[model samples]
Target: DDFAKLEEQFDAKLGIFALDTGTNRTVAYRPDERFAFASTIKALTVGVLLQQKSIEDLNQRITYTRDDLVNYNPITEKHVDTGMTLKELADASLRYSDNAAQNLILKQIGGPESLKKELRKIGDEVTNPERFEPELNEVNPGETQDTSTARALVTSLRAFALEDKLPSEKRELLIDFMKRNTTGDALIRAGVPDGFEVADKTGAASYGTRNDIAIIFPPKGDPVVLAVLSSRDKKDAKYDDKLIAEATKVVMKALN
Candidate 1:
């Protein structure tokens, strides 16, 4: 352990898990604690789409009305008239964290319950998304609604990003979108070395909740997968992005 005793350092409840794919080593902190999935669930949303749908099928267009728009939609709000394809929607959901894009894709597929069912089908019973975007970000304390554990998040991430769960093209496409994500630059990315290649999904929700799950490839070594989640007890507390980055930095240093 490079830097020990994190709970005393941050003003939030933390749940974390890390795995080095090469050595099969892991690190955990409150790994079983329930934490909000927030936008981090978008990866699974896009993953299921890629796993079941074909590349050509992903190119098919998906349209939405103003009702589809939500509070935090950055991309789909501009595309209401022009619409977007499934692939484009996936990209927006992952890269930009577009709430409407995620909600629309979820509804088109089968909504949040359907996504949860698919996750359970693949042996992921711990990761639950009960509601659609914005609502799911509530992350009420001590409640299971729309929350996930660090262990389950890391497990699901490894399956999709590193393991053979999804075929090569589909898996790679999801990774590609995450690699170019616009939301996590100062998150896990900030903690890693300059040469490391990182693919991550980030989340920010109510109650000062913030999270990141990542697959990082260090130069001249194998990959590392990590999930870090946190939430303060009080409502509307300011989220600390640097706290997550610093946590990642310590984890990466230990793994290296």
Candidate 2:
């Protein structure tokens, strides 16, 4: 039953690991293989932001014009609004999958070029970071960033979980901020038992390409790493969720 379900869904491979302060166990796929990381990069964005900035400044009021809210495109003209703080924007970007919020945060974090350099400094070779370049007037006339991998992402998530260890007080602020940014509608959260605190980010490009990386810290046991990446035909929306759920159940049982 274990190998059957995994083989049926995962064409190339799928990976799982249980991590704590001690032993880390691997199951199914190679723990180090690279796959396109979606919104998961935002985890790193949060980390770098915390490492360099202060959350005290995050509470200062910052407006979120309708142009800054991208998840609801063609957002009603009446919805043109403001009066959010940088903290609010960061919270919206992580918890709600707000494209506009992410764009604004990305721009503030030294734009795409600086982000790429930051990733390189952290030894991430495949992080394809791009910002919204509207002046060049490129295709789609939208800001676009590149991809990341599940393994690389788990490292970032670990940092998020251990923010207290950061060189300064930034760790606690990041932990608090991440707690505020907990918005994703995907597998790990859906299949897990109720009331479990799943801190993670999500990314969906087109239909089939969906990614989610989260740390499921079970109250009575060791924490688990749940990262899923799947590419499907755009025609099928239902299958995406099904794949996620299936993957979720698989990991849940594996951890049990």
Candidate 3:
């Protein structure tokens, strides 16, 4: 009954999954239905790279040519020729959702194929990317640009939050980046009360699609991992944001 309200309040197709990290309690709605992942997949890309490479590898510099530029990217706008380390690129990707930085990391790791293989190896079979960012339309018509289910995202978040796969230092780095993310303050984080901490990633597309996956740390209890995804035929990112915010408030209230 509580979860069904997410669909009634948001005028879009919705999928949600939330887990109590300590108790393993779970909740969901259409958790298996796939939708375009948008920038949220950047977290996974970073995860794969961290799992394969060392922190030192992330610190190595990588040049960015004009050819790497993508629309809506601030990373390239500022450092096109000057270049940045893989660590800085990754920080930009996760913190600012910079498309250019994401693609640069993807390129460094051998493109979408390597990411796909790594994801499958980790038991996440749903989230897949066909091409780099800003090329969402390049995929076959009717095909989702990058695909993921709420269930898959929550699983991946668990791996990151619980340090199930990644080393402790790398896991801490990824979580720290998400905690410092500049985007999504008006989405899930807005619904949370002050003094609580939320580490999260947000995603959006031209259509009425908005999504966020987060690990919410309550001062008095175990962390909660939640994912909310929405898709609509009409384009209204603002509406999608409001929906996710409201859903977050409800979930947080229930959990806390």
Candidate 4:
């Protein structure tokens, strides 16, 4: 009930799914609606790539030209010559939500279609991957690019979070990357109490959309898988951040 109330007060199109891993209890609001993927899709990209390449392969050096560079990316800003390893690239892409790193991965994986295929392989039929990062505008100008439902996202998170699905080392690596994520700290993570652990991916598009999908590790209970997505008529970063934080607080309260 509070989740529905929060959705109404936020005044943005919202999609949420929260699952209790131990009890299988869940809560959802518009969990089926498709929301723009933004940087959150980077997780899907990296997950698919890891399935193909070993962790050691991630250390192999790779090169990129200025053509691969994109503005607003810390990776391109700092590493201009002789690019970093695939591991570093993945780290920057997920940790800082770097646009250049994301683009480089997309290029390496044979583009957006490959990523979509991987999503389908993992049982996600609702995500439509059509564009690369930094091209925040919709592919067709009027339709959202790289869109996904909250249900699809939660399924992907389960793939990442459930130990039985992914090998221990690989799963730990991905989870560690998310735990160390520097961006989106003010969204879902903001709602969590001090000293708690949360691993998540955050996404933002130009059309006032901010999204976060996370696994919250409570001090005394099983981890909670939560995804909160918002699409607003106008961009308001502060408001979106607040909405995510409040929604997360409510989910935690209800679950705990």
Top candidate when judged by lDDT against the true structure? 1
Task: Show pairs that collide, candidate 3.
Answer: none
Candidate 2's displacement at residue 231, Å, is 1.6
Model with the higher TM-score, candidate 2 or 3? 3
Q: Pick the TM-score winner.
A: 1
lDDT of 3 by residue, 79-108 (tens): 887889989988999999999999999988
lDDT of 1: 0.87
- Per-candidate TM equals 0.96, 0.74, 0.92, 0.92
In order, the Cα lDDT scores of the candidates are: 0.87, 0.55, 0.80, 0.78
lDDT of 2 by residue, 114-181 (tens): 76777677676656666442221121212234655566566556655553325446655544555444
Lowest lDDT sum, 10 consecutive residues, model 4, at 136-145
lDDT of 4 by residue, 75-134 (tens): 765786867888898899889888888888877777899988877877888888788877
- Candidate 4: segments with Cα more than 4 A from true spot: 136-144, 163-165, 235-239
**Sorted on TM-score, highest at the top, how do the candidates line up?**
1, 3, 4, 2
TM-score (C-alpha) between model 4 and the true structure:
0.92
Candidate 4 residue 188 Cα shift, in angstroms, is 0.6
**Cα displacement (Å) at residue 46, model 1:** 0.4
Displacement of the residue 219 alpha carbon in candidate 4, Å: 2.0
Candidate 4 whole-model C-alpha lDDT, 0 to 1 = 0.78
